[PDB]
């Protein structure tokens with residue numbers, strides 16, 4: 001119920017006021033909530049959530065939004081600027097992701113986020129495989145670690161999703177993937193890296209598996225697309241993961257993540273225009289005129305595409321290199337510190353999204369102790385663990401040292417009381433062992449709580 | 455047109471470009487593009503457009519720019535804004551008449567509200583009626599998004615004909631209903647001709663068959679309640695009708711919020727719960743989605759909340775009065791040009807057609823004078839969706855003078871077909887496979903560097 005802390009701070013609104021409220025009063029309330037909320041992400045207490053977070057970069061993008069606020073890309077005749085920004089965002093991302101190696105046929109679109117990029121990629125493989133291979137019962141083979149949006153795509157578009165086991169390094173077991181391929185498989189996927197444990201899947205081998213079966217290979221680089229090319233140039237071990245690989249037929253990369261654009265954008269890329277074409281929706285007989293959508297949406301907030309273009313141009317190759325170096329050096333420091341705490345262990349060998357578990361202590365209480373110190377960490381299960389996705393906010397002076405000091409104490413306090421399960425720890429413990437319908441019932445109730453007006 | 459005016463960026467620059475330089479380029483494009491919508495030349499596209507209202511919303515955006523409602527623990531401000539936008543919208547659309555069970559979510563736009571409602575009806579029907587081959591019945595005039603939904607979620611869409619008033623023929627909708635029908639829909643109003651369908655009749659049809667009734671009020675949700683209070687004739691179209699099970703309404707249209715938001719409402723929580731996505735076995739943790747997206751631009755929900763609050767009932771009533779008064783004056787003027795006809799009897803989205811002349815040439819003559827109108831087909835026509843931008847001094851008078859000149863020019867030369875007029879003509883005559891081909895090339899053209 002700390003998800004509803006303004007219940008007794010600001011007046012609630014279940015109905016429109018009769019008279020319009022003063023603009024200065026609306027602004028005062030919003031700024032007051034900003035004063036309460038901003039320190040958590042600004043001062044480096046949030047895992048992921050805010051990727052850049054510098055006040056001058058934010059002020060720069062807020063100005064870009066302001067200049068382009070009326071932009072709706074559904075009307076390129078009215079906003080040709082925005083069509084230019086989206087075309088250039090896609091062209092620049094494709095090039096960064098080995099697009100020239102594919103022969104200059106790499107194309108794509110700007111989306112509302114990573115989820116849309118993954119859903120669109122799944123719908124496209126389903127539609128392409130039906131029209132060209134005649135598959136009417138589509139299947140998709142992905143590792144267990146692959147994004148929850150794959151499950152969302154399966155249920156929405158009627159694709160059978162086959163999730164395959166991981167190895168001891170929390171990487172996709174490719175042999176398990178090969179064994180799951182049937183004549184109905186439309187796509188195989190790999191994560192670069194996956195969200196739970198920040199490990200990069202063996203993409204060259206996943207791409208070669210797809211190529212030999214004549215199926216799609218989607219690379220989910222939503223998290224790593226804007227990190228991994230720079231990590232490669234810096235001396236860090238990163239296998240080829242993009243269009244440089246022959247079997248790779250699509251890549252998703254989030255401009256609103258490490259691209260450092262404003263929330264609300266991502267990029268979906270395909271190796272060829274013939275694949276891209278299956279993503280489009282075209283209505284030819286509607287009295288409202290000829291209608292064509294490249295993505296899920298009709299009307300779109302064009303100003304957010306402009307923030308993505310403005311962010312990429314302001315950073316350039318050097319900015320992205322320098323941002324990755326900072327993130328990866330902060331990650332190296334954090335990994336070394338965690339590995340020096342006796343009761344903790346890191347899952348796999350990640351470069352910057354660090355999952356921490358314990359064979360000795362209840363990691364959910366260790367996590368709860370951190371929450372008690374203001375840390376906002378992602379809680380994981382299968383296995384129980386928490387993770388920290390390092391951002392530019394965690395590269396600021398003293399943030400990693402503050403995390404390490406607070407983790408040292410958290411472990412000590414749980415080592416003294418291993419029975420302690422306070423706050424959110426029993427919920428996470430319950431959740432990890434709960435049957436799916438109990439999880440479904442509790443999640444439905446949590447979403448309903450978010451929409452409560454009192 | 456910026457091809458040679460501004461340098462093209464097909465690759466990231468080696469070194470970052472100065473922030474001031476990027477802003478100067480974006481502002482340059484802004485100065486060239488803003489007059490079209492600001493001076494009232496664009497049909498729909500920009501719904502409010504006043505400099506001070508825009509400046510207020512841009513400041514609301516700046517204060518909430520980091521907001522991501524995927525994290526309500528970090529941004530409880532946005533979860534509150536989304537709850538209150540839904541509550542206020544539900545109340546405005548007769549939600550009280552349902553005893554307090556009306557609930558919903560904020561979406562990215564009108565398309566997502568329509569897509570979400572179609573998937574909810576599909577999932578609800580499979581779960582409770584055992585329907586595995588779902589169908590949906592809509593008038594031919596219902597948004598193209600119903601076809602996107604049908605194709606995405608594997609629902610058979612059955613489009614039914616209109617009557618002489620361009621309103622849905624409900625007798626035809628009844629004849630399309632099979633035991634596999636999960637939902638029927640009506641528009642309030644439809645986009646093509648701006649006419650409200652017979653929602654009472656459609657909602658009665660749905661209730662009688664135990665199926666859902668979706669009302670597409672994306673365009674009219676923030677106009678119609680206020681049109682009613684003003685004494686204008688409007689068929690009841692919302693939760694006042696027992697048969698209506700869901701309503702969609704766009705806050706980013708006549709709600710005057712910034713682009714990127716809409717609302718989907720359902721009559722009951724049991725219905726809404728079929729919209730939600732829940733993953734229970736993912737190592738990334740328990741994952742729940744109220745809509746299609748994961749991360750979302752929470753700042754756009756804040757602009758919707760801020761707009762609704764700054765206007766209130768009086769603000770919406772004043773905005774609707776101005777738009778309806780501009781529409782009355784525009785419709786009267788059109789009716790004083792006998793070569794033209796209005797399709798149906800719309801309140802503010804006016805479609806104009808001609809039996810005597812080539813309407814696509816009349817449209818071309820208006821485009822020459824700066825007008826940005828929507829070209830329609832089945833039948834050939836154009837439309838004007840009136841906004842607060844057309845309520846400004848002399849915009850409708852300018853429109854009617856340009857329209858009188860456009861008609862005199864086409865009457866002088868019935869054979870004239872210039873600019874975009876042969877394109878529209880060709881496209882209205884074209885087989886669907888050629889329409890698909892040209893539109894694909896058009897999208898490829900938009901992403902060309």
Ligand SMILES: COc1cc(C)c(CNC[C@@H](NC(=O)c2cc(C)on2)c2ccc(C#CCO)cc2)cc1C
Pocket residue numbers: 073074075076288289290291292293294298564645877878881889892893896900
């Ligand atoms: C085959 O040749 C043609 C191809 C096209 C597309 C046109 C123009 N038709 C207007 C249409 N635009 C788009 O589909 C669109 C998508 C993107 C991106 O840019 N434009 C549109 C846009 C919005 C509504 C609407 C609405 C209520 O929500 C209706 C129609 C003309 C000809 C002759």
Ligand SMILES: COc1cc(C)c(CNC[C@@H](NC(=O)c2cc(C)on2)c2ccc(C#CCO)cc2)cc1C
Pocket residue numbers: 114195379427428431439442443446523524525526738739740741742743744748
């Ligand atoms: C009652 O059982 C539970 C139910 C929930 C939902 C939680 C929280 N789990 C974190 C989860 N959040 C959400 O699903 C969510 C949606 C909205 C709105 O608010 N939260 C999340 C969010 C994002 C990623 C990700 C990613 C890469 O894209 C992963 C997990 C905990 C327990 C024990």
